[PDB]
Enzyme design. Sequence first.
Site, short mmCIF file in Angstrom:
data_model
loop_
_atom_site.label_atom_id
_atom_site.label_comp_id
_atom_site.label_asym_id
_atom_site.label_seq_id
_atom_site.Cartn_x
_atom_site.Cartn_y
_atom_site.Cartn_z
N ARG A 198 94.98 1.13 -46.99
CA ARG A 198 93.64 1.06 -46.43
C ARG A 198 93.63 1.45 -44.95
O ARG A 198 92.72 2.16 -44.50
CB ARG A 198 93.03 -0.34 -46.62
CG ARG A 198 92.79 -0.74 -48.07
CD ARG A 198 92.16 0.43 -48.82
NE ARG A 198 91.80 0.14 -50.21
CZ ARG A 198 92.59 0.36 -51.25
NH1 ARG A 198 93.82 0.84 -51.07
NH2 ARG A 198 92.16 0.10 -52.48
N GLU A 243 94.21 5.06 -44.72
CA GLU A 243 92.96 5.74 -45.07
C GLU A 243 91.96 5.81 -43.92
O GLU A 243 91.26 6.81 -43.78
CB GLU A 243 92.28 5.04 -46.25
CG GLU A 243 91.08 5.80 -46.82
CD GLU A 243 90.57 5.22 -48.13
OE1 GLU A 243 89.87 4.17 -48.09
OE2 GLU A 243 90.86 5.78 -49.21
N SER A 276 97.35 6.28 -25.98
CA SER A 276 98.77 6.03 -26.18
C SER A 276 99.07 5.00 -27.27
O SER A 276 98.35 4.00 -27.41
CB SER A 276 99.42 5.58 -24.87
OG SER A 276 100.71 5.04 -25.12
#
Lengths: 155, 155, 155, 155, 155, 155, 155, 155, 155, 155
Positions: free
Chosen positions: D95, D98, D121
């Site tokens: 997830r 994703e 960063s």
Amino acid sequence: TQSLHYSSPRETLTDTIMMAKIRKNLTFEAINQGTGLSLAFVTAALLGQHPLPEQAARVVAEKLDLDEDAIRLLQTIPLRGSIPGGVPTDPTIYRFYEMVQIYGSTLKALVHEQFGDGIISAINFKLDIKKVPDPDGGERAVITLDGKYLPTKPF
Amino acid sequence: TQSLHYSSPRETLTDTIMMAKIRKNLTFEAINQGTGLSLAFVTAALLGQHPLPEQAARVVAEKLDLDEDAIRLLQTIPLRGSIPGGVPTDPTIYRFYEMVQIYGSTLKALVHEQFGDGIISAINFKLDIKKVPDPDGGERAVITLDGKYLPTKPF
Amino acid sequence: TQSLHYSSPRETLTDTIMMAKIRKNLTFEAINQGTGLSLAFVTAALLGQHPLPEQAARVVAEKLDLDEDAIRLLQTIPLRGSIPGGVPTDPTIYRFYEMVQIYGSTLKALVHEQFGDGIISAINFKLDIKKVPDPDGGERAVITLDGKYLPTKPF
Amino acid sequence: TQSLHYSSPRETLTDTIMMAKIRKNLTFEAINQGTGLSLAFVTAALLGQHPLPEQAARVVAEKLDLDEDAIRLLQTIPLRGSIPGGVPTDPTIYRFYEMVQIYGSTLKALVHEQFGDGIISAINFKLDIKKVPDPDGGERAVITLDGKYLPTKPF
Amino acid sequence: TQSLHYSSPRETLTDTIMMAKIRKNLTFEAINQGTGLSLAFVTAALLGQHPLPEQAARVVAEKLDLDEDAIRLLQTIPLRGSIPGGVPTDPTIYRFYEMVQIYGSTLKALVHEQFGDGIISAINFKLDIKKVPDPDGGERAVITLDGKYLPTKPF
Amino acid sequence: TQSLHYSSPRETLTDTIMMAKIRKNLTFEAINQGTGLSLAFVTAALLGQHPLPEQAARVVAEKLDLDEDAIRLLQTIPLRGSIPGGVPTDPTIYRFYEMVQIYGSTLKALVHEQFGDGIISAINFKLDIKKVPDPDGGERAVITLDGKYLPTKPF
Amino acid sequence: TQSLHYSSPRETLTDTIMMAKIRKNLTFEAINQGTGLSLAFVTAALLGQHPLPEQAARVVAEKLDLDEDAIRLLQTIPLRGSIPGGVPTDPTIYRFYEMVQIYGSTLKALVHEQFGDGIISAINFKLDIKKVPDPDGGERAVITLDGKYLPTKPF
Amino acid sequence: TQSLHYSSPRETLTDTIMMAKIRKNLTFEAINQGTGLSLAFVTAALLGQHPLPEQAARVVAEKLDLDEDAIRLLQTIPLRGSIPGGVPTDPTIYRFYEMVQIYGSTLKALVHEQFGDGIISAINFKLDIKKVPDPDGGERAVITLDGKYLPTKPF
Amino acid sequence: TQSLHYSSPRETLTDTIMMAKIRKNLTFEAINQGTGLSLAFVTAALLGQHPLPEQAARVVAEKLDLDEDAIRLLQTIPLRGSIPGGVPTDPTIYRFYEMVQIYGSTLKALVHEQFGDGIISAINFKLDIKKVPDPDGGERAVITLDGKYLPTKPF
Amino acid sequence: TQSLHYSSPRETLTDTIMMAKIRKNLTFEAINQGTGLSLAFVTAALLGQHPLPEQAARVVAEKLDLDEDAIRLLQTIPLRGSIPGGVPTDPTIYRFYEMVQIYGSTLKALVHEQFGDGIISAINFKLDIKKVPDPDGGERAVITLDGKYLPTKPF
């Protein structure tokens, strides 16, 4: 019945089909009216994964203003596969991919236990999707995969 | 509830479990008797894809001669994924992989048409497999994938 | 609401959009003025990752000189995924990829500890990015990932 | 401080740590008590992604019965990366993978708009997760990615 | 300053630039005259890896006969990456790829020994190449990678 | 001098070397005292990327308590490559990987401009890293790549 | 009949079997005596690709000095796939792989012309190999692939 | 005889051929009448995997209305390979792929037993497909792979 | 001498060259007449892997009817690599790929035995191919790979 | 003549061989004394790529103190391939890999020009490497690849 061993002409057709569908604001259910075929099969064919028989092809061509070259192409057996590269990124498709990732070995085990050695076929096979209410509110999709068991026997 | 981010401990347990199942010539149906849980969920857990609650863990452990370390490990949330590399070669598993390759775009199209933007969940989700006779002789597997619709809406 | 199972139409639209944006020297903040939606959601839609509701589609269309075909396409659910091939090489995108590579196992462990078995949803989900000054001079980005917990429970 | 360019010894340590944690039924929150460090950072280090300063190391080692060889290894800078092969299959990790797949281009766009050319960063960086109630019922996770902006300037 | 999340428009500009340069038989050194910027930086921008400030963009544009659309795109932040697929086959590029393959673990080791935990930045960073005679006849290239040390510190 | 065409024996030696180094809390600089060789070359050799001449091998073996099988193995030419799979995840190594991804085409272009057709050698080649202060505060690494130019000429 | 969803135990049995066969200098033809099954099927089973029925298992075990744990494992359905990674490097196997790469599109085309939409099955399927004299002197292998046609029909 | 080291011009010819075949609703068998060559060889050539001798080329060209540039191109040795990426997703082609995945090691083992060290050639080689009735009803394809044994001998 | 960091303009040129060679039915041997350069070098340059000196470029251009822009581009240093993706499927190319797969480790072993640490150069390097009679009938190709030994020595 | 379809036993034997060669400080040339076979063939066999005739096996076994089980394994046909994953990283092997990458299409072009359609065999094939003085100083390796032309003939 004609076939193709590469996907680009059918992809071009599918794009022509989807632009017409979007422009006309149609649904797949409405496009499938009067084809004599199930929504899942015809949708898959419009999306480039199956040939349509001639009369079904003409019915959908009427609704999307496709010419005779498209009607012929719609009748050809395609080079199948609807996920380029095999690994989907789209969440909606990925969830179904994930179900197989997680339950794949469970499916193998229970197929061999309940049927025997062999496979559940993806060719002698029907798919449908149904919308049902969730008791706790909202809705659920029930996707049914119905494949013939083909045994592996010693030869 | 404990959890693991790497798969080798559960893989080791799963192998322990399978060797016992094979030695005792047991089925998953037999092993699952008394857990009060679905065969597909408990099979998946034995194959390393779910944690069992402790009562179900002790039920399967008795059938398989599993010790208290094994029982603890059966209760831990695993690192999920049952196909190393994502792409199966085993024909039985591959057929289910193949169903998604071919019908993925159809599944997406019809979910969006019949539900809306969003996904069918692979977590709020149930799977089961049933054997039914084929009228033409032989057997068919009807696999049900049953997931909650989760909408995608603007924010 | 229409949907697409391939990305090339939205990619073309996105390119039309960016060329207009660059020609007119606009910002995403200025394009989003009037939509009544979050900058991150509308930006992602312009970049081909979401559909816009018609009101917001017309609002951004006016700023960018987009025609009616473009307005209809902006309203279609796309095939999502903004990193071709999955693995980014662009340093800016790669740093977010690296955050998941490094802290992925930590995120899993703490989700299971603090919530339980299951997932933090990427669909019932909001993202936002905020700029705050760094005390040592310079600037920091605070990116918020806000998703619903969805439990995995036995069935 | 020592460092390692391969992951297996640290993998071994992590395994030792997780087996003791599971055996003793500890939480990371409990293990982190008295370390003087944040939960996310120490969890990451226990899972093999960071060194711990000597005293934090001894503190966790006391709780998990680790010997001096393990304490020495906990202080080594590791070869980082917590997703073998880079692409997660585990739904909980996926997830977050994703979110970057979907919002990656949006994150790049708004970083450049709001900060300029350069990167957020992943090293001058902190992460935390909070559990917050959902107004529509249930729970949400709010994950904060807090990174320094590093500009790209012409040289 | 504008940015793009996809490479094709910039790839097109780079081709236009390279065809102009080859046609007029220019060197990068001669194109860089009057930019006030370093050769490696401006060359990278011409090849699609950096934005140019407007003045420098107008300077190189005058020499390559670029129009206003080009000058504007030359100022946009690109999607960076100069090796399609990440692995080069061209021997010249491959040698530099090979230096990192062979010495990567040494670099990590000496960075942590001499600086500590963290990275040598690829953003707060300058690159240059110098030609110097080899004593045994022929020529050597001295490529200098000069990056900021960013510590990883426990939080 | 002997050579190996596979890496497992050197990887095992490298592990033995590292475990001794961590146990004795040595630096590579201290280990290299009296080898008559540069730090980067010997560090690479310890990490399994180079053979050592017999006496350098004995000097480092005395410090790390290696027997005569390790001393013999230290003198062997290895199968070189320090990043398994070629793509690093470790942020420290990745930044050097990323330098080549971004500046690869620039390096090629400037090499051909300043030297001609051919390559800069990764074999007739020296590497070194230097720590220099940053005038704006902090520290920088200067990595020098010093390779012989090898022309491609018509034959 | 039992099945396994992972290859390691069966790989171990296959190794045991091959070491016995080599040690006793047996042929697959000699081992197959008295099974009543085809050489190709039983060879594939010994190499870990099929289960044997119990009688055949006991017959081959007698010749290989296999115990009861092995006889039981030889009866289990394996996780199938005989080329790790899918792409072979061994010339003998690769030539068969090559036949499909070259003639794959032809096989598709002629299957669809001569049979129709659908597949030639790899499960309802027999393989055999015959040695025959080449008239020009030397030998040829005639490998026969004999599979059931399964139609794809619209539903 | 001419040859090509890249596939695009031959893929373009193949598309032209297929579009004419579909337009005229021809079969490969009909197209092959009077070529003096077998169906599998000519089909392979039409699909871009083989050159045709000039007269055969003209015979098929008359039937498909190809001009002289097409006839010249039909006579060129192509860059062979009919499955882009090597791994097919189309079920028809995949089944043949799968037979090699599963029987690969068996084919190797029986080639070495019955012929000796070496290979069965994919070049000194003939393929043909035959349709035969299935005793239990339906139809079977019998594909014959007929290759020369080429021995490996000490040199 | 100019150079390109991408292959598309050179690929286009190579196609123009090949379409002319096929149209005019020329051989590489004929095209090469009067270049004063080896057949292997000039063929490789025609196929996009080398620059030609101006004189050779104009000689081959006259035979293939190439304009001045083509002549200029033939003199540019290309991005090298003649096998897209690195792994060939074409059987002719693959056999040479296979020789390296099989004999790679032997080549390494004997190079280090007979020369020392280091490499055989692929840049200070000549290739040629000769047709010779096979004493047992037929023909053999003798391909000669002639590379400079470059030592690796401690620094 | 026995064969194997997997490489681990031969890899172990090869390790045993190499550890003995290093311990005894032998050269392949010395190990090969008395076999009657070419250095390249026997070196490849020792490195796990060929079987030895029993006579050669026993000769090399006496020099390396190999037992009877090792002598037997040395006579087995292996699963061939000397570069794990196909893509080498070691510079010495990579240079040979690189020659095929660059000159692959040229080798194809000239094979077809000088021989016709078909391949140069990698099986009916001899390899050898010669050390030759460089006239301009240093040493060269001349690697000879000697393969039978196998025609592709229309059928």
